[PDB]
Design a protein around this ligand. Structure first.
Ligand SMILES: *[C@@H]1O[C@H](CO)[C@@H](O[C@@H]2O[C@H](CO)[C@@H](O)[C@H](O)[C@H]2NC(C)=O)[C@H](O)[C@H]1NC(C)=O
Ligand SMILES: *[C@@H]1O[C@H](CO)[C@@H](O[C@@H]2O[C@H](CO)[C@@H](O)[C@H](O)[C@H]2NC(C)=O)[C@H](O)[C@H]1NC(C)=O
Ligand SMILES: *[C@@H]1O[C@H](CO)[C@@H](O[C@@H]2O[C@H](CO)[C@@H](O)[C@H](O)[C@H]2NC(C)=O)[C@H](O)[C@H]1NC(C)=O
Ligand code: NAG
Ligand code: NAG
Lengths: 48, 48
């Protein structure tokens, strides 16, 4: 149901964020890409 | 008197921040943990 990012050699799931992930280009080029939220940790701070 | 994070093979003390550190869980589980202020680099910008 949920999407997580984890270290490779031990299951420690954590929320997808702009800290855990890096961008590269538009979605069409990658074979097998999937859709999700990526949380932006600035936004609750910016909002308050 | 003061707590720093340094690279391992050459002494270069840096202030402890949420950039040069990462979280995992509450303070109870770790044997030999210590208490200090992690400087959050966004707080002077939230003050601005
Ligand atoms: C996939 O993992 C997530 C995170 O552990 C599960 O979502 C939690 O599920 C429990 C039980 O239903 C709830 O109490 C939590 O509030 C849920 N957390 C969130 C952030 O939604 C999810 O149930 C797991 N999915 C499956 C199919 O096992
Ligand atoms: C992932 O999400 C994107 C954006 O919602 C989906 O792309 C759109 O898909 C529809 C139906 O095929 C097209 O009409 C649109 O032109 C697409 N692009 C945009 C920008 O809306 C995509 O289909 C989703 N992929 C999966 C596997 O669910
Ligand atoms: C590290 O800091 C925490 C938080 O101030 C200390 O936790 C307190 O410990 C006393 C022990 O008698 C408890 O009565 C308090 O309820 C605790 N506070 C909280 C907010 O839980 C902890 O003792 C400190 N550890 C060391 C080794 O100094
Ligand atoms: C994975 O295999 C299924 C087999 O039905 C196929 O439909 C799907 O296109 C494959 N995945 C990718 C990324 O092509
Ligand atoms: C560190 O070592 C000393 C001597 O072995 C012991 O008395 C002390 O309880 C230890 N403290 C921690 C935090 O491990």
């Amino acid at each position: 149901t949920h999407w997580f990012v984890t270290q490779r050699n031990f299951y420690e799931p954590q929320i997808i964020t702009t800290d855990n992930t890096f961008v590269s280009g538009n979605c069409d080029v990658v074979i097998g890409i999937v859709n999700n939220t990526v949380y932006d940790p600035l936004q609750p701070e910016l909002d308050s």
